[PDB]
Design a protein around this ligand. Sequence first.
Ligand SMILES: Cc1cn([C@H]2C[C@H](O)[C@@H](COP(=O)(O)O)O2)c(=O)[nH]c1=O
Ligand SMILES: Cc1cn([C@H]2C[C@H](O)[C@@H](COP(=O)(O)O)O2)c(=O)[nH]c1=O
Ligand SMILES: [Cl-]
Ligand SMILES: [Cl-]
Ligand SMILES: [Mg+2]
Ligand SMILES: [Mg+2]
Ligand SMILES: [Mg+2]
Ligand SMILES: [Mg+2]
Ligand SMILES: [Mg+2]
Ligand SMILES: [Mg+2]
Ligand SMILES: [Mg+2]
Ligand SMILES: [Mg+2]
Lengths: 188, 187
Amino acid sequence: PGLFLTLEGLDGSGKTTQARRLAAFLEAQGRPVLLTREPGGGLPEVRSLLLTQELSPEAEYLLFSADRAEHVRKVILPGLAAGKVVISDRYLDSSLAYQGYGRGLPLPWLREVAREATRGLKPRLTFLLDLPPEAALEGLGLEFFRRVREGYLALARAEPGRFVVLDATLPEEEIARAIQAHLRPLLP
Amino acid sequence: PGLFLTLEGLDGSGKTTQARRLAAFLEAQGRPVLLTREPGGGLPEVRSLLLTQELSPEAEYLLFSADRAEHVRKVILPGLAAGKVVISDRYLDSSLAYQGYGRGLPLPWLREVAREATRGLKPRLTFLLDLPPEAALRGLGLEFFRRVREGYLALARAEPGRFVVLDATLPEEEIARAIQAHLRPLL
Ligand SMILES: Cc1cn([C@H]2C[C@H](O)[C@@H](COP(=O)(O)O)O2)c(=O)[nH]c1=O
Ligand SMILES: Cc1cn([C@H]2C[C@H](O)[C@@H](COP(=O)(O)O)O2)c(=O)[nH]c1=O
Ligand SMILES: [Cl-]
Ligand SMILES: [Cl-]
Ligand SMILES: [Mg+2]
Ligand SMILES: [Mg+2]
Ligand SMILES: [Mg+2]
Ligand SMILES: [Mg+2]
Ligand SMILES: [Mg+2]
Ligand SMILES: [Mg+2]
Ligand SMILES: [Mg+2]
Ligand SMILES: [Mg+2]
């Protein structure tokens, strides 16, 4: 039971605002909700480790993955088991976009790591707030953000049932209404 | 060129003393040497975090792997590139023994994770300091340690061209001499 939803996008895309808005919206309907986030929902100390100077992209991903593994096991799966709507502000797609398309790590390896880390748990829907890259860890420059932005769009084209792509430049309340509309058939 | 060697075993198996004796031997022969260790050779902060917290074995392994990825890139490969003999007290086999055999994680997955983390770097020889957990110099709790001990022995018998298994209960100087004898053909 339960319903697993995620929000994705660049830094500054509004996906945090929308995750919180959505949690409150659902709670106002009387639904049990668990709002969480990555990095840090699993292992809060990972945020310290991720700041390490000159971190290799492989190490970077492995840190995100350690947090994710703890997050899935200790937070998300137990929430879903209790019938909650679990909303994560970022999940595996963030790694695929940032560490895969951004840093250049091989997607198949990212997925193999992830398969045990996540126990195969995938969100039902993922709301991608698509932000122009100039409107957006070391080396987070414009070239990187272009790769990440386009990578997210690629992920969305590859799983077009799961991803809902939203124009992050729209007013926050219009974005929220669009998210709500996509959810109504799942949450009567 | 360099030469990459590792030491493995339970904590308190002497592998730490033997790493020091081996580096001293090599220093006496005028051979440049770098001694290092896991966890913490890559990300000290991982070592200190794992000292005081316990996680799922998957998360545990992924933290050891992040440390290892940094260790290989920033410490081991540069030492080998300079022509040093690099000796690590613990490497990937520790994860296989502790997280794999001990905590039950699947070995093929561990090895797939590792393949990128390590850039495929494997030691030329690994000295396993074998002893029962009750003999380690540093009972339901013993079951985990026996799984790890037996896991190391299983790793060793699968790769008899890489592992050298030593009686860790022997006197320290005798173990060191046996390590030296195994190494001399490779120098
Ligand atoms: C979850 C996740 C986030 N990130 C990035 C997105 C943001 O730049 C940053 C999160 O920083 P924050 O903890 O300050 O919000 O980490 C990744 O690179 N990969 C991931 O897997
Ligand atoms: C390198 C490594 C160590 N360990 C454990 C074995 C010991 O319990 C501990 C050694 O840490 P310490 O020597 O820093 O105290 O780390 C693993 O479980 N897996 C690993 O991959
Ligand atoms: Cl945001
Ligand atoms: Cl030891
Ligand atoms: Mg992952
Ligand atoms: Mg997601
Ligand atoms: Mg794969
Ligand atoms: Mg031990
Ligand atoms: Mg590893
Ligand atoms: Mg080894
Ligand atoms: Mg065993
Ligand atoms: Mg055995």
